[PDB]
């Protein structure tokens, strides 16, 4: 709660140790006042001013050094970009590495500028707070006197917005001429309505707000987002998205604002997966409202869609061809699979991000609602239209019967991080994600939840969060060796339900270092068989006729073990290939080998020591 406590985690550690010593000055003031029992002395004020002056000088010197460094870096990068542009028309201009490192340097400069601005503002606020507190507690007046000293060393009057604009212009130029590290993270959370204001206040201390209005005013319909999802009668896309199949696609029509908007975005989300993990893609193209219905029936051809873009010629022709191919694929899939609107999701979105900085992005979705728009029951809800027009952007939708509407009782938080390799995410983000205000729900989706909740009498598989919808989520305030890793896991390990007719469907992902595991186990079995097989052959052609029955026994044992191992390996490979869940504990192997070996050995002993 202390001001110094919030100052500590405001920025990274390299900016610490240079902040105003607010806590030290406050403690000194209180201690001196207590010792002298009031009655402030001129020498005490002199020492207070000396400490304030040395702190001010330190802050001013640090700010001056940082400003000089930032300006020098900007000038150097601008000259480098200009030289690269001059060399663009020359022979062999690299585009895959130089442009990327230039962009990385630009992003680093932007982050440094933002951090410096926040540092200056926080220090000014601390100075004002301590001066006000000293004036209030002590009978003497200091604010008019110290205002002159602050104005003599203006570390807070620097304008960093022009630098941001210039760096953004350079970034745009590089992106424009660059068309022939870092790690993403994305997490979702549920927030109780009682904690929305506190969460918003916490977020607002680090990022500004985005306003979709020319007057920069907060209007009711300026933040609404509406999506219509498409699916067939068998709900093929629902199951394809629930069980995360390769190439699973979601098709939606989206618009922003009220019912006066005449731009509808056709969007397709495609899920792809490798042994690295989660390489998903997203595509979209714009369309006019009056041509949407025709586009859903093929009457509106793809040629008429991109006529304006072809005529104006602003966009390169190859990108136009790519968009034409995407539109053709979407239309063909829509016609072939017999897709129709099935569900609508509505919510109000608030976005938090810094201009030109992609390190942290936050999104908050409130008033989440799902509305049924299908004709499977037997009632036509859209009347041949692509959306039902009896409701639009008016929450809550009270003119809808309770069987066609689902009202989500929580808000959805979305955190996107883009962290440079070698450094940790900001402390405030980590303290936010782990706290009593949010409940993490990985891989939450609005389309799946809407379909499961509304058409609950037509689906066999449901997500994991659906049965837990009645759980109260309020919480009170709070290289290595592979064999060695397996040994550590062994040491560590050694020392509710879906409604009837439905099963909780969860996809299973395996670490890539399982592909090499099973084969190794397989090999560790195969050699064993060979050894046993060896016995068989040395008792099939080198022994007396009275000892071949033990050869038969070893033959049977070797065949059994080998075919068992082949069966297990094939089962494991085919199950891992198609994303099923497997059992990794083989309970039959050791016992079968034990019994077969004992039987073979004893039988051979008896047959060679009989009569």
């Amino acid at each position: 709660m202390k001001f110094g406590e919030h100052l500590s985690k405001s920025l990274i550690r390299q900016y610490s140790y240079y902040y105003i010593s607010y806590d030290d000055l406050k403690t000194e003031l209180e201690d001196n006042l207590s010792k002298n029992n009031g009655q402030w002395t001129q020498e005490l004020e002199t020492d207070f001013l000396e400490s304030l002056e040395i702190e001010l000088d330190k802050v001013y010197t640090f700010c001056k050094v940082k400003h000089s460094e930032v300006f020098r870096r900007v000038k150097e990068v601008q000259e480098q970009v200009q030289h690269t542009v001059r060399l663009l028309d020359s022979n062999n201009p690299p585009t895959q590495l130089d442009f990327e490192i230039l962009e990385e340097e630009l992003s680093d400069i932007i982050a440094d500028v933002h951090d410096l601005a926040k540092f200056s503002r926080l220090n000014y606020t601390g100075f004002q707070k301590i001066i006000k507190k000293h004036d209030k507690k002590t009978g003497f007046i200091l604010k008019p006197v110290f205002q002159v000293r602050l104005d003599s060393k203006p570390f807070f009057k620097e304008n960093y917005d022009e630098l941001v604009v210039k760096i953004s212009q350079l970034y745009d130029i590089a992106r424009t001429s660059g068309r022939p590290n870092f790690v993403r993270q994305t997490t979702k959370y549920w927030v109780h309505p009682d904690n929305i204001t506190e969460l918003k206040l916490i977020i607002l201390k680090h990022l500004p707000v985005l306003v979709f209005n020319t007057n920069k005013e907060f209007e009711r319909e300026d933040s609404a987002i509406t999506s219509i999802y498409f699916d067939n009668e068998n709900l093929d896309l629902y199951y394809g998205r629930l069980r995360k199949d390769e190439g699973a696609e979601a098709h939606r029509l989206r618009w922003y604002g009220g019912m006066s908007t005449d731009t509808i975005f056709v969007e397709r989300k495609t899920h792809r997966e490798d042994w690295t993990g989660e390489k998903s893609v997203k595509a979209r193209f714009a369309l006019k409202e009056r041509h949407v219905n025709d586009f859903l029936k093929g009457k509106y051809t793809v040629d008429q869609v991109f006529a304006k873009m072809r005529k104006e010629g602003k966009k390169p022709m190859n990108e136009i061809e790519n968009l034409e191919a995407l539109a053709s694929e979407i239309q063909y899939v829509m016609l072939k699979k017999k897709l129709r609107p099935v569900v609508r999701s509505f919510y109000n979105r608030t976005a938090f991000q810094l201009p030109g900085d992609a390190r942290v992005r936050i999104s908050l979705d409130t008033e989440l609602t799902m509305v049924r728009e299908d004709n499977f029951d037997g009632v036509d809800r859209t009347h041949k239209n692509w959306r039902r027009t009896d409701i639009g952007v008016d929450w809550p939708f009270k003119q809808l019967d309770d069987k066609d509407i689902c009202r989500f009782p929580y808000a959805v938080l979305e955190v996107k991080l883009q962290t440079q390799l070698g450094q940790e995410p900001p402390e405030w983000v980590r303290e936010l994600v782990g706290s009593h205000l949010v409940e993490p729900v990985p891989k939450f989706s609005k389309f799946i939840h809407g379909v499961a909740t509304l058409l609950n009498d037509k689906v066999d598989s449901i997500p994991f969060w659906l049965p837990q919808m009645d759980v109260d989520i309020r919480k009170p305030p709070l290289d290595f060796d592979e064999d060695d890793e397996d040994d550590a896991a062994l040491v560590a390990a050694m020392t509710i339900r879906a409604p009837p007719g439905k099963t909780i469907c969860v996809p299973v992902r395996v670490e890539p270092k399982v592909y090499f595991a099973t084969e190794r186990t397989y090999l560790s079995w195969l050699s064993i068989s060979i050894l046993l097989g060896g016995v068989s052959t040395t008792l099939l052609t080198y022994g007396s006729p009275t000892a071949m029955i033990g050869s038969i026994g070893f033959f049977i044992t070797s065949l059994a073990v080998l075919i068992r191992t082949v069966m297990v390996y094939a089962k494991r490979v085919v199950n891992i290939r198609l994303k099923r869940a497997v059992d990794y504990e083989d309970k039959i192997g050791p016992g079968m080998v034990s019994v077969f070996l004992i039987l073979s050995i004893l039988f051979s002993f008896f047959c060679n020591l009989v009569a």
Binding site: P144, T186, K282, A286, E482, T546, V566
Partner: protein, 678 residues
């Protein structure tokens, strides 16, 4: 009408002499010689300057001495009624009728004094600006007017006069406890809005050297709003990975008599303003909004309310909509929105708004007058309408009227100026002197909402920032009024009234911290005294992922171990064929096992190389190769079965027509020999 005619027709008959001599001063300025040109020979001499300064000095002396005398007379009468109040005793000796008549006389005198001050100030400002426009060599004469204005007992601003507040609360106490009946007077009730008992707006000017500090002070408490454009048709992409300030222009409307400006400057309740607003350039096809804004006051608390009617326009339909009274656009838009799927209530409201704005424009004969461009910065917590702060910068005014019937600045049949919105990269070079103006400061507005009857907001950091050396408070400032005063304020034909904040524009508005502290102390003391007096007389007197690399290496090692074992078995069987009981059979097992060891080595190497290729970079759906592990096992099964079958097929032929087997094991062989087929 002309300023001279208005001055002549508004003179109070008892006060003929006290008014300004506008015509005499204009003649003494020799404005006719400037007007006519032919005989410009008689220039401006020092004797003429001395005479003009002399006449202006005595005019100012007469006018302001009369004003001060009248103001001093009224306040004192009202001090009397104040005596019969303090004493909880002289209270019972009071009389209603004489006090009511005195209050009515005081109100009439205050209104007359306000009109007198407005007229005289307008005349003096016009004269001073006219003199300063001509004869640039000689020093300006605005110092005389500034000195005379500074001597006034009160502050020259658009705020209500202190006499109004005094009379208001005197009437409130007279009506409250002494005699509820026998009041009768209703004109005195109009001042009841000023009685101390919501939505309050404060306006300030900020110098360019103080913007960063006030921005830091605001950002301590409120966030910053960043403008983000809604996605449009040009933002369509093909395939990306997951998670892959504008200039505001407003054109204002008014008629040839400037009725809207006059009514707004006179604080007439319900005075509207009409404007067109957009951002960016007009050649990018942006959204154009037609707004009508009104402030109305219907309550005894004095709290005002603000109403706005907004319509969206198309660039083609504006000319017919605002000039020819064409109702085509209304029907076209209504049909378009009905086709889009808008409900009935929104359509009814849109039709009503269209009717209201079109009727307003037709009745009042409004037309575009001026254009203002600026940049806006806002601070507000989302979902919290309690407080808002906004700042406007880089304000610029441009004349966009058609008042000159011989060389119109804008065509009478076009809704906007043609030359400014051309394709030339820098159109503002075309502008001539006197057709544009630049406001030197930044304008900050603070809106505070206290819905409950909480006795004014009175919140902490707002009052801390207000009483500081960083801002200069200008009550009731407006961008439209300032633009009209700047562009058309020097012409007697159009503007006959001027705002009281004009003289403060020339002075340096920067303040030292010490003077600001002293003024803060004085203001706080005055407010505390007023509040204490009100409380005293109110109730007291009330009645690199190396792990995969290691795994690949270990898998290759295991494959090599299997190959070694197979080769060892192969050569052990092969190099001992001569001692085999069936040498014709041991020559095939060695061959097949040699083939198996070669295949194992080749497959191990090839799979290792392929998986190393996959590991380098990032590709491949899966890391597996099940073909070899299956083929090796299948071939081993086949070889073992064939060896067993051949051995036990030839074990019967050798014992036919040739002891060695135990008796107990005799039947068992007869089973296998039957299974093989002998």
């Amino acid at each position: 009408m002309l300023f001279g005619i208005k001055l002549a027709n508004d003179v109070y008959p008892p006060w003929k002499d006290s008014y300004i001599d506008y015509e005499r001063l204009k003649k003494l300025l020799k404005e006719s010689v400037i007007h006519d040109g032919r005989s410009s020979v008689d220039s401006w001499s020092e004797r003429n300057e001395s005479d003009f300064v002399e006449a202006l000095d005595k005019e100012l002396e007469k006018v302001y001495t009369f004003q001060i005398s009248k103001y001093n007379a009224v306040l004192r009468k009202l001090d009397d009624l104040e005596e019969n109040t303090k004493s909880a005793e002289k209270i019972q000796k009071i009389n209603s009728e004489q006090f009511k008549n005195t209050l009515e006389e005081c109100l009439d005198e205050a209104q007359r004094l306000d009109n007198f001050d407005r007229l005289n100030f307008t005349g003096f400002i016009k004269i001073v600006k006219k003199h300063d426009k001509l004869h640039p060599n000689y020093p300006s004469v605005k110092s005389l007017l500034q000195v005379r204005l500074k001597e006034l007992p009160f502050n020259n601003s658009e705020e209500y006069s202190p006499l109004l507040y005094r009379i208001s609360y005197l009437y409130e106490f007279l009506r409250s406890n002494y005699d509820h009946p026998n009041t009768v007077s209703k004109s005195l009730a109009s001042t009841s809005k000023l009685s101390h008992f919501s939505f309050k707006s404060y306006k300030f000017w900020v110098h360019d050297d103080n913007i960063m500090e006030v921005k830091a002070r605001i950002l301590r408490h409120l966030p910053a709003l960043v403008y983000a454009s809604v996605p449009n048709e040009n933002d369509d992409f093909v395939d990306n990975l997951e998670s892959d300030d504008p200039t505001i222009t407003t054109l204002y409307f008014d008629n040839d008599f400037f009725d809207l400006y006059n009514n707004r400057l006179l604080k007439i309740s319900g005075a509207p303003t009409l404007r067109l607003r957009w951002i960016g350039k007009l050649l990018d096809k942006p959204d154009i909004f037609l707004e009508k804004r009104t402030f109305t006051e219907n309550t005894e608390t004095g709290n005002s309310s603000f109403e706005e009617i907004r319509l969206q326009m198309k660039a083609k339909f504006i000319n017919n909509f605002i000039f020819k009274n064409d109702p085509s656009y209304k029907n076209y838009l209504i049909n378009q929105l009905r086709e889009r799927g808008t409900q009935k209530e929104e359509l009814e409201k849109l039709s009503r708004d269209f009717d209201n704005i079109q009727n307003f424009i037709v009745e009042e004969k409004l037309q575009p007058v001026l254009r203002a461009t600026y940049n806006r910065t806002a601070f507000q917590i989302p979902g919290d309408q309690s407080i808002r702060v906004t700042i406007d910068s880089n304000i610029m005014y441009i004349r966009e009227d058609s008042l000159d019937k011989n060389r119109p600045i804008r065509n009478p049949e076009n809704w906007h100026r043609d030359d400014i919105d051309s394709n030339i990269p820098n159109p503002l070079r075309f502008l001539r002197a006197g057709e544009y103006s630049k406001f030197p400061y930044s304008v900050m507005e603070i809106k505070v909402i206290n819905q409950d009857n909480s006795q004014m907001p009175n919140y902490e950091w707002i009052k801390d920032l207000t009483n500081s050396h960083l801002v200069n408070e200008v009550p009731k400032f407006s961008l439209y009024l300032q633009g009209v005063a700047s562009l058309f304020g020097e012409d007697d034909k159009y503007v006959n009234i001027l705002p009281f904040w004009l003289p403060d524009l020339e002075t340096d508005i920067r303040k030292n911290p010490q003077e600001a502290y002293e003024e803060e102390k004085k203001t706080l003391q005055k407010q505390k005294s007023i509040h204490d007096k009100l409380d005293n007389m109110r109730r007291l007197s009330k009645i690199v992922e190396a792990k995969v690399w290691l795994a690949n290496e270990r898998t290759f090692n295991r494959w090599l171990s299997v190959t070694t074992l197979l080769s060892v078995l192969t050569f052990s069987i092969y190099n001992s064929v001569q001692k085999a009981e069936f040498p014709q059979l041991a020559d095939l097992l060695a061959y097949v096992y040699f083939f198996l060891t070669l295949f194992c080595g080749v497959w191990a190497y090839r799979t290792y190389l392929k998986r190393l290729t996959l590991i380098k970079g990032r590709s491949g759906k899966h890391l597996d190769a099940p073909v070899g592990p299956i083929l090796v096992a299948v071939v081993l099964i086949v070889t073992l079965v064939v060896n067993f079958s051949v051995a036990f097929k030839e074990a019967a032929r050798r014992e036919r027509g040739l002891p060695s087997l135990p008796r107990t094991l005799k039947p068992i062989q007869d089973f296998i020999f039957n299974l093989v087929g002998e």
